Amino acid sequence: PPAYTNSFTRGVYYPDKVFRSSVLHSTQDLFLPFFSNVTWFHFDNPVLPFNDGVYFASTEKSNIIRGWIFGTTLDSKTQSLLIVNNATNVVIKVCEFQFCNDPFFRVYSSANNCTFEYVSQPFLKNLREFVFKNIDGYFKIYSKHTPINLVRDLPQGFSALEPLVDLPIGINITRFQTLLAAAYYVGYLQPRTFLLKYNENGTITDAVDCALDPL
Amino acid sequence: SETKCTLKSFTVEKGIYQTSNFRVQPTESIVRFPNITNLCPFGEVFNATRFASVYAWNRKRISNCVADYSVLYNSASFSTFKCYGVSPTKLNDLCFTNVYADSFVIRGDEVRQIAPGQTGKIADYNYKLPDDFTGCVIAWNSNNLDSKNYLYRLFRKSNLKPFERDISTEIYQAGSTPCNGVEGFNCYFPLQSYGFQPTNGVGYQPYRVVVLSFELLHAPATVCGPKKSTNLVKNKCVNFNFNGLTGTGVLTESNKKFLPFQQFGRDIADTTDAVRDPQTLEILDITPCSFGGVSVITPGTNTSNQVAVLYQDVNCTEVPRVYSTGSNVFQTRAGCLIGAEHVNNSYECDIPIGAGICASYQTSQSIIAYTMSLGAENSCAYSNNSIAIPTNFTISVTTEILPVSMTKTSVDCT
Amino acid sequence: MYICGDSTECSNLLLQYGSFCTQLNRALTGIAVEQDKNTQEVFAQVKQIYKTPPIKDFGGFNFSQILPDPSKPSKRSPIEDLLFNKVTAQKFNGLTVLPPLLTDEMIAQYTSALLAGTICSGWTFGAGPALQIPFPMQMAYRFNGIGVTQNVLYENQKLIANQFNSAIGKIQDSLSSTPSALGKLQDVVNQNAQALNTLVKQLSSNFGAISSVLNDILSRLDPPEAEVQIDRLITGRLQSLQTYVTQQLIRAAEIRASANLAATKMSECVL
Amino acid sequence: MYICGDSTECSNLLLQYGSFCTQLNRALTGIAVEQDKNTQEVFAQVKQI
Amino acid sequence: PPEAEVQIDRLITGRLQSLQTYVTQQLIRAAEIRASANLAATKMSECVL
Numbered sequence: 002p003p004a005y006t007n008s009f010t011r012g013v014y015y016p017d018k019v020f021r022s023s024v025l026h027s028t029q030d031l032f033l034p035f036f037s038n039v040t041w042f043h044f045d046n047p048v049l050p051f052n053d054g055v056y057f058a059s060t061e062k063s064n065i066i067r068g069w070i071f072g073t074t075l076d077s078k079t080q081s082l083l084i085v086n087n088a089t090n091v092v093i094k095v096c097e098f099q100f101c102n103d104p105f106f107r108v109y110s111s112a113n114n115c116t117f118e119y120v121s122q123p124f125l126k127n128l129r130e131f132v133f134k135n136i137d138g139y140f141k142i143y144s145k146h147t148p149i150n151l152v153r154d155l156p157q158g159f160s161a162l163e164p165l166v167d168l169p170i171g172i173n174i175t176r177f178q179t180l181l182a183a184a185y186y187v188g189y190l191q192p193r194t195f196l197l198k199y200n201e202n203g204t205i206t207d208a209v210d211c212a213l214d215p216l
Numbered sequence: 217s218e219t220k221c222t223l224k225s226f227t228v229e230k231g232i233y234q235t236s237n238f239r240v241q242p243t244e245s246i247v248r249f250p251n252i253t254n255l256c257p258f259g260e261v262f263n264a265t266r267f268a269s270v271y272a273w274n275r276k277r278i279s280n281c282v283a284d285y286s287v288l289y290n291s292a293s294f295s296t297f298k299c300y301g302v303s304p305t306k307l308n309d310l311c312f313t314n315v316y317a318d319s320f321v322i323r324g325d326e327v328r329q330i331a332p333g334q335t336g337k338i339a340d341y342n343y344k345l346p347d348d349f350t351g352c353v354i355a356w357n358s359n360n361l362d363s364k365n366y367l368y369r370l371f372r373k374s375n376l377k378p379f380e381r382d383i384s385t386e387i388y389q390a391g392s393t394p395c396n397g398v399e400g401f402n403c404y405f406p407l408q409s410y411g412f413q414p415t416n417g418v419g420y421q422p423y424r425v426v427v428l429s430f431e432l433l434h435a436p437a438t439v440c441g442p443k444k445s446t447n448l449v450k451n452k453c454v455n456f457n458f459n460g461l462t463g464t465g466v467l468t469e470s471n472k473k474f475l476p477f478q479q480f481g482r483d484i485a486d487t488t489d490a491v492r493d494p495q496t497l498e499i500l501d502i503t504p505c506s507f508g509g510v511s512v513i514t515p516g517t518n519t520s521n522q523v524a525v526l527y528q529d530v531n532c533t534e535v536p537r538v539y540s541t542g543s544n545v546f547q548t549r550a551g552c553l554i555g556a557e558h559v560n561n562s563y564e565c566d567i568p569i570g571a572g573i574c575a576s577y578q579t580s581q582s583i584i585a586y587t588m589s590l591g592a593e594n595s596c597a598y599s600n601n602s603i604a605i606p607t608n609f610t611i612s613v614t615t616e617i618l619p620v621s622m623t624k625t626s627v628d629c630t
Numbered sequence: 631m632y633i634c635g636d637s638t639e640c641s642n643l644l645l646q647y648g649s650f651c652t653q654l655n656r657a658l659t660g661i662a663v664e665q666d667k668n669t670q671e672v673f674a675q676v677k678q679i680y681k682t683p684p685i686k687d688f689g690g691f692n693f694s695q696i697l698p699d700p701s702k703p704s705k706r707s708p709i710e711d712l713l714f715n716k717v718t719a720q721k722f723n724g725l726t727v728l729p730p731l732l733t734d735e736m737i738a739q740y741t742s743a744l745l746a747g748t749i750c751s752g753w754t755f756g757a758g759p760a761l762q763i764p765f766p767m768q769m770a771y772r773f774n775g776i777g778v779t780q781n782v783l784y785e786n787q788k789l790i791a792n793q794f795n796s797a798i799g800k801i802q803d804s805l806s807s808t809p810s811a812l813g814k815l816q817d818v819v820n821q822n823a824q825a826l827n828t829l830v831k832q833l834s835s836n837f838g839a840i841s842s843v844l845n846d847i848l849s850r851l852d853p854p855e856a857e858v859q860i861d862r863l864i865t866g867r868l869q870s871l872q873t874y875v876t877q878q879l880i881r882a883a884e885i886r887a888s889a890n891l892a893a894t895k896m897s898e899c900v901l
Numbered sequence: 902m903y904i905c906g907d908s909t910e911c912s913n914l915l916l917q918y919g920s921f922c923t924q925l926n927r928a929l930t931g932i933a934v935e936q937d938k939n940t941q942e943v944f945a946q947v948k949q950i
Numbered sequence: 951p952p953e954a955e956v957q958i959d960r961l962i963t964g965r966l967q968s969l970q971t972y973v974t975q976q977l978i979r980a981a982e983i984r985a986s987a988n989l990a991a992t993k994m995s996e997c998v999l
């Protein structure tokens with residue numbers, strides 16, 4: 002679905018792992034632009050690029066799997082990053098297994114020389130914000146679960162988007178796909194400069210996008 | 217003498233001269249080498265009862281973990297340990313990306329064929345190590361447990377490709393017969409069988425050889441030796457290496473509240489004002505332990521040769537040259553002053569120390585430190601219907617010196 | 631300490647720049663001594679410390695808002711307390727703030743002595759011995775100095791005293807309600823605070839080197855090229871220090887012109 | 902624009918020198934503001950025309 | 951000559967920096983001396999004359 006929607010002031014994560022109390026810090030990083038047009042995809046399972054980064058969201062508590070298939074060729078030619086959640090694990094297998102033309106462990110039908118395979122505790126009304134990026138072979142995932150009342154789209158708020166997990170991978174992700182009444186949003190990160198406001202707790206309680214308007 | 221040399225002169229006037237600086241040296245360094253973390257399972261590839269053969273190895277592709285080469289190096293359980301161009305100890309410091317281990321059993325004497333450099337006949341058919349091989353090869357005549365299936369390559373014509381997996385067993389001699397005819401007269405199985413019984417000699421006994429070739433450096437780096445983790449030595453100027461953050465200071469206890477994903481504590485400007493130790497997950501406040509400035513108070517050279525020493529912003533206990541902590545030690549807001557006696561009488565300021573404290577040369581003669589007096593204490597007698605009229609005068613000739621011009625100087629730049 | 635933090639390898643590379651670091655310290659010491667001279671010149675004009683009269687029969691003039699408050703711990707007048715309230719572990723990289731030679735309690739005594747001398751005698755305590763005079767008679771001398779006869783004050787003493795008290799009372803409200811009331815002093819405070827922040831924030835710049843940390847350069851790289859990278863860092867940090875020192879010199883020359891005007895206004899208007 | 906005329910590589914290289922251009926711009930803006938204040942101090946003494 | 955123009959470049963940079971520092975400090979000191987001389991002229995006109 003080509004429907005667009007406004008992201009408002011959502012999609013800002015912690016650029017680093019440094020505590021800051023009452024510091025208004027300017028960070029130049031791949032951030033989601035303020036009041037940007039993010040694509041709302043309804044059931045559907047389209048193919049979407051990656052470019053520099055990807056923003057993800059969820060609305061209802063249906064909990065329909067919601068894995069991811071970050072790849073670069075996805076035809077058993079290069080290592081592909083697959084994330085599978087089964088309410089007990091977050092299995093991240095980077096391997097060239099060949100996903101079918103319409104993926105939905107039967108996603109793939111092969112087993113190549115599968116590399117690093119981190120597995121840990123699961124992390125996945127209830128808004129579920131995610132940010133996926135890759136800079137120098139390190140796949141970074143940030144996530145935040147927030148409670149809100151569903152009305153029409155992403156709410157107007159700014160909680161924290163705390164970081165989730167960094168993985169040493171080394172591949173390049175040029176494309177990605179979503180695993181599965183589907184309803185989600187996709188935004189694209191851009192190399193912006195953001196002024197982040199830290200409170201006494203080291204929490205980013207406010208942010209300003211220094212490209213949106215003259216003020 | 218320090219004042220004389222810092223001024224490049226043999227005579228010094230009266231005043232305070234800043235000679236050198238003061239800094240408390242670090243007592244020790246704290247790294248306290250790291251956790252168990254995720255260990256590399258080398259014991260599985262070494263202590264393998266079902267050891268494979270040279271034609272087909274137990275291909276163990278090992279990934280992010282800490283491989284303790286020191287464990288395999290300080291123990292002489294295996295007969296021979298080799299590692300390419302690297303001492304085993306430093307093997308725990310310089311690290312790499314990923315490792316691949318191939319384990320096999322060979323026939324005794326021909327342990328030297330498998331080598332990155334010098335060639336061997338066995339390496340020409342069974343397995344040739346890469347020319348740019350960098351790994352660790354462990355060989356030992358295990359015998360007993362693995363001695364009582366074991367067939368070794370004997371029929372090939374080209375050296376095995378660097379880091380290749382070949383398990384071919386088709387029957388042929390070399391190329392001469394146009395039709396091999398299964399086993400005609402000499403085309404036996406390439407995997408020749410041998411006797412692996414205890415009666416065999418050292419050169420014909422099962423020799424367990426395991427190669428541990430690690431891939432060269434790429435964009436990531438996961439298989440690394442022991443690094444990270446810290447400890448606590450609080451209230452002491454020490455060098456600390458906290459997860460790669462290296463610096464000198466005092467790690468006092470802190471009441472800060474880090475979120476459970478932040479480690480550093482850079483607050484305002486870019487200085488690290490706090491840190492988190494990855495052993496107890498507590499917050500330590502980094503502070504500059506002590507520094508200041510050594511200033512010499514001297515009443516000139518013509519008048520005398522005695523001096524006093526002021527340390528700018530240090531305590532009188534933190535001062536350890538000659539005598540610097542015994543007697544005549546007075547702690548003022550402007551620092552710790554030694555060599556000067558505190559007098560309760562207040563005089564006009566002579567040598568300004570700071571914070572209302574001055575120093576002077578007075579009585580034999582010594583150096584006194586006092587609180588400067590603002591002036592004569594006049595009593596003001598205000599009274600209405602009362603006036604004061606002068607009945608005499610004085611003609612006072614005062615002086616006023618004013619600079620007007622400086623020396624005109626030209627410089628030939630070329 | 632600022633350029634080469636506790637690194638002997640960097641400190642040995644700083645020795646070949648000559649007396650670049652012995653000159654910035656000299657300039658900063660001169661600036662500090664000049665600040666002390668400014669403070670002493672503005673306030674320490676008269677040396678006799680006159681005591682505040684313990685009475686209130688000044689002919690109707692109030693003076694309570696300018697004379698020191700004995701009840702409060704600090705001996706400061708309400709106006710001085712308002713002005714002090716309006717204006718708002720050592721640093722890591724060798725930056726220290728030396729304390730002023732004249733404490734705030736010592737300057738307050740100088741101000742109180744000047745006020746007591748003005749109330750007691752008028753202008754006669756700044757040109758010789760202090761000759762006492764009743765304040766209604768002293769104000770008749772100052773009325774006589776502006777072309778107005780003596781009888782104008784004596785026949786309007788109550789009205790003049792009431793106007794004086796009302797103006798002094800409104801001074802506090804005007805000072806405590808204007809947004810940029812003490813804007814000049816606050817700008818003086820802010821300019822130095824931001825200069826130090828910019829100076830210390832220049833230690834996180836590469837200046838063309840591979841990293842802004844000397845330990846990373848010394849460990850990752852071989853000494854021959856670590857020398858080049860450390861020299862680049864030294865050049866950058868020395869340039870930053872020189873910029874800070876020059877800007878502080880210009881700012882201190884600007885402040886010294888305002889301290890030579892406060893000392894002139896003290897002599898020609900307070901005395 | 903003076904040091905690196907419309908060149909992105911030169912701008913990226915100059916970004917490694919910290920807040921130098923910011924200091925220069927602040928100084929020049931302060932000079933301009935002082936120049937505007939001088940005329941008001943000299944001529945705008947009485948504000949009744 | 952090819953390798954003698956890199957050390958000479960460092961010498962030139964250092965000596966130029968020293969000269970510029972000297973000129974700047976002398977300019978500030980000359981401004982202070984000019985202020986003092988203006989005060990001296992004012993005292994000569996107001997008090998001697």
Ligand SMILES: *[C@@H]1O[C@H](CO)[C@@H](O[C@@H]2O[C@H](CO)[C@@H](O[C@@H]3O[C@H](CO)[C@@H](O)[C@H](O)[C@@H]3O)[C@H](O)[C@H]2NC(C)=O)[C@H](O)[C@H]1NC(C)=O
Pocket residue numbers: 686692693694695799
């Ligand atoms: C000089 O002027 C000051 C004020 O500028 C006079 O002090 C004022 O004294 C009056 C009368 O005592 C105080 O008014 C009363 O104070 C208390 C507390 O509020 C209470 O009884 C009444 O509600 C009433 O307000 C006034 O607060 C006080 N002002 C200050 C600032 O302390 C002083 O008396 C004058 N000196 C003279 C007349 O000699």
Ligand SMILES: *[C@@H]1O[C@H](CO)[C@@H](O[C@@H]2O[C@H](CO)[C@@H](O)[C@H](O)[C@H]2NC(C)=O)[C@H](O)[C@H]1NC(C)=O
Pocket residue numbers: 073074079173175
């Ligand atoms: C890794 O990144 C490089 C740089 O973008 C990719 O290179 C080009 O990528 C496009 C789209 O992915 C390909 O169609 C081109 O053929 C690539 N150009 C060349 C000549 O390299 C590269 O493909 C990425 N890696 C993978 C395996 O996708």
Ligand SMILES: *[C@@H]1O[C@H](CO)[C@@H](O[C@@H]2O[C@H](CO)[C@@H](O)[C@H](O)[C@H]2NC(C)=O)[C@H](O)[C@H]1NC(C)=O
Pocket residue numbers: 201202473
């Ligand atoms: C976030 O800040 C709040 C408000 O300052 C913290 O709540 C206070 O916590 C401190 C100790 O950290 C207590 O002394 C206060 O009584 C608390 N106040 C209230 C109103 O609860 C809160 O702990 C911080 N969150 C953290 C540290 O995770």
Ligand SMILES: *[C@@H]1O[C@H](CO)[C@@H](O[C@@H]2O[C@H](CO)[C@@H](O)[C@H](O)[C@H]2NC(C)=O)[C@H](O)[C@H]1NC(C)=O
Pocket residue numbers: 251252253494495496497
């Ligand atoms: C590394 O090992 C240290 C101890 O050497 C572990 O510290 C533990 O911390 C807990 C509290 O978090 C203490 O109650 C335990 O006593 C400590 N363990 C031991 C064995 O003393 C630390 O958690 C380890 N870090 C890892 C495994 O990442």
Ligand SMILES: *[C@@H]1O[C@H](CO)[C@@H](O[C@@H]2O[C@H](CO)[C@@H](O)[C@H](O)[C@H]2NC(C)=O)[C@H](O)[C@H]1NC(C)=O
Pocket residue numbers: 607608609610
């Ligand atoms: C005013 O003071 C002057 C001195 O400043 C007095 O003159 C002195 O008088 C004494 C006593 O006769 C002599 O011993 C001194 O030699 C005089 N000094 C000078 C400089 O001439 C003068 O008497 C005083 N006038 C009054 C009226 O008391």
Ligand SMILES: *[C@@H]1O[C@H](CO)[C@@H](O)[C@H](O)[C@H]1NC(C)=O
Pocket residue numbers: 531532533547
């Ligand atoms: C020691 O230092 C502390 C903390 O700065 C200070 O309060 C105390 O007065 C000092 N004591 C002595 C004896 O110097």
Ligand SMILES: *[C@@H]1O[C@H](CO)[C@@H](O)[C@H](O)[C@H]1NC(C)=O
Pocket residue numbers: 558559560
């Ligand atoms: C100065 O006064 C203090 C405080 O009363 C007293 O202890 C000390 O002995 C006095 N010193 C001298 C030299 O009189």
